[PDB]
Design a binder for this molecule. Sequence first.
Ligand SMILES: [Zn+2]
Lengths: 49, 145, 100, 103, 114, 59, 115
Amino acid sequence: MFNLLKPKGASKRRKIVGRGPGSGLGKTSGRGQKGQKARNTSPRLGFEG
Amino acid sequence: NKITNNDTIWIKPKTVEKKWYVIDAADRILGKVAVDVVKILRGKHKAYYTPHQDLGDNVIIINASKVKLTGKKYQQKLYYRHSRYPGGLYSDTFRTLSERKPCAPLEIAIKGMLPKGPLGRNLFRNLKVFSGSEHTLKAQNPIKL
Amino acid sequence: IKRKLRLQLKKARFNASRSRSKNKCFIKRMENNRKIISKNNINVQVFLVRSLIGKLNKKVKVLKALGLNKIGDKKVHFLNESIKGMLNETINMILLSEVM
Amino acid sequence: MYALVEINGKQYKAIEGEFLKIDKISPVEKDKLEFNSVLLINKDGEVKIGKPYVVNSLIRCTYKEDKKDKKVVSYRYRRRKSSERKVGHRQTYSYILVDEIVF
Amino acid sequence: ARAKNGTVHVARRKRILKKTKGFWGTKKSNYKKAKDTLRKGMMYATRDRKVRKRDFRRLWISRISAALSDTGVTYSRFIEGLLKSNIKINRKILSNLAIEDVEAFKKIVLEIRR
Amino acid sequence: AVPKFKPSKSRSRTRRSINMRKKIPQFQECSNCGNLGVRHRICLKCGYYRNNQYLEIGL
Amino acid sequence: LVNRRYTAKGKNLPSSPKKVRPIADNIRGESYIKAIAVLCSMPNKGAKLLEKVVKSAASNAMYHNKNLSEDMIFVKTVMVDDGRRRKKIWPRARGRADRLVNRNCHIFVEVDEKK
RNA sequence: ACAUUACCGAAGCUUUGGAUCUUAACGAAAGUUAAGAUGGUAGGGGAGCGUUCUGUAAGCCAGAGAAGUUAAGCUGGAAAG
RNA sequence: UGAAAUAGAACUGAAACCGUAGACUUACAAGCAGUCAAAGCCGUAAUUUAUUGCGGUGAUGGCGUGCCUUUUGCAUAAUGA
Ligand SMILES: [Zn+2]
């Protein structure tokens, strides 16, 4: 027993997402409702629609 | 140790002892008579009234055939019923219903004004209506009102 | 019965079912408020008696400028022209008493 | 004989030799309580009613303990919105033994 | 680094089933029905905890009104005189008084009628 | 023509208990051997019936 | 509860518990003679299976308690549980197949000396 | 319809406790008080519970009964212990 | 025989599901089945002893349109188990 005693703020946790309603990042997991963006994608080419 | 309960008091219905009240309906108005009867039956004249349980007294109505109405109700008030068969709607004006069943108008009115459900039906069980001026419950020494 | 007519009828009945006693109480309060506002350079205590929900945007802004956010709000103000104008704007939602 | 007494704005029916469960009272006043706002006194037949307090009438009590109630849970959830909240709670109560009712 | 040990779901379910003991039919043993009924029950519990105050005050008012039916004081007028003569006794207390000791309540009423 | 919702265990239990119910046959002890035989039937143990042999009971 | 000296148990018998339970109801609590007569009379597969188990239970009781004859014994308790299942295939039209479960039952009978 | 005096009536307000946060003051800080502010989907920020594995651990608790399931009771503001 | 034979062709044996026994309740009743009040009966503990608690059942009263997706809006007779 010597208790390394990490400095505070030295490691953020993560943004674990899609793991329940209470975490605020629930079913939709930060993506919104529908559309192109809800399914992995966004047209990259500096695109302006 | 003992704690003084400062909570609402409920009186055990096995220590309440039901009396009978005679109400005369001669020359009175149908709705007023029914309201009085309902207030007595419900238990709303006792300090320990409770809507859960049956704590009010019982009521005997005499002279039920002499209730007076106002307006043209004697000719115009309709009592409806349905046989549950198609088209089987039967109406019955106050005159005809009174002649065929002298106690029917007052019984119907009281049944309408009583609450609904098992306790309401029980309260209506607690009521006796007589057409004439005499009743058969002389053994209970009912208190006149 | 046609839906247009029954909606109009239901709304008309609700509107018309207001109590003259309540209206008289409101009239008395309004008269008292106008009498107080007619004064000049006195400290007046303002109570908020009607909610902010559903009222006009301009009037909500006026009430928050007076300092009242909830019903039961108590604020003492010195009657000058500015406060008099604000009180006149929002006379129907306030109760004015006077600070002797 | 009993008293109708107000403590911290709550009525109670005090009887001698007999506990009252009231809202938690401060640790400062865990020694010996005197209550001066008596609303009514019934003594062996005759009753005195205060306007609003019966004068020259005290209740003297001894603080006994604090005790927590059963746990209650406040729960709410929004249909087909996937959101809720749950909160526990346990209210604390103080028990005082009424010694005498100055009547 | 597989992290499977399933001693968690059984725990949730055991707590839920412990709280849902006396329910009718399949709501007492199945996980899905028990969780649905419990969750709506707890929300009912909150709502009803706030409603109990209204219910009991209504009961007290009705009891007072019943105890006054004898005399000629309608209890709106009774509350009137009560405030006007500055007697700050409570609805619960008066309701209980009219049952435990009727004559004290009657004396209060005689005193109000002034 | 298909069940709309699964019935409750109460309804299933009620129907099952009412239908799957078999009735006891009547009895009457044989005048010869004292066995309890079905009333109005030849005794299956001794063969007599109203004091008359009709069977020859084997193994 | 069981005086396991006095009992018989028949495991994996070839009948369905739904079909054997009513016969058990008709003899629960009866005297041994009456129960044996009922089971001999009634022409049900479950009746025959119960007959064997009940006779065995009475035999065990008699063997361990020599002063107990056939007419002080009454069938105290009777329990019929469900046992292993076997699935076989029943083929139907259009290449559709259905699975066709065969159920077995456990039977537990305890006798006791009459009142 | 018009007047007089009332009452009922919500999670609004007042009263009685208890929790967190912000601001201000006191205080050496810790904290103690004064004020208000805490419905919430999409979405942003912060703080925790629990699971597995490794170091701490050739430690500690176990055949006098370990993990696991099961019953009762109890505790925390929730996960849960 | 074995420490164990509900280790006997199988360790630990949960839930779904199927029973038996006992306690209470149910055949005048319209119950998203739960929650808030609540008599009677049963078990237990106190206060000497028929009144309070904790428990289990529960006559009766008030309130109450499952859940998840997707929607301006779903008890919806929209989807899904
Ligand atoms: Zn024979």
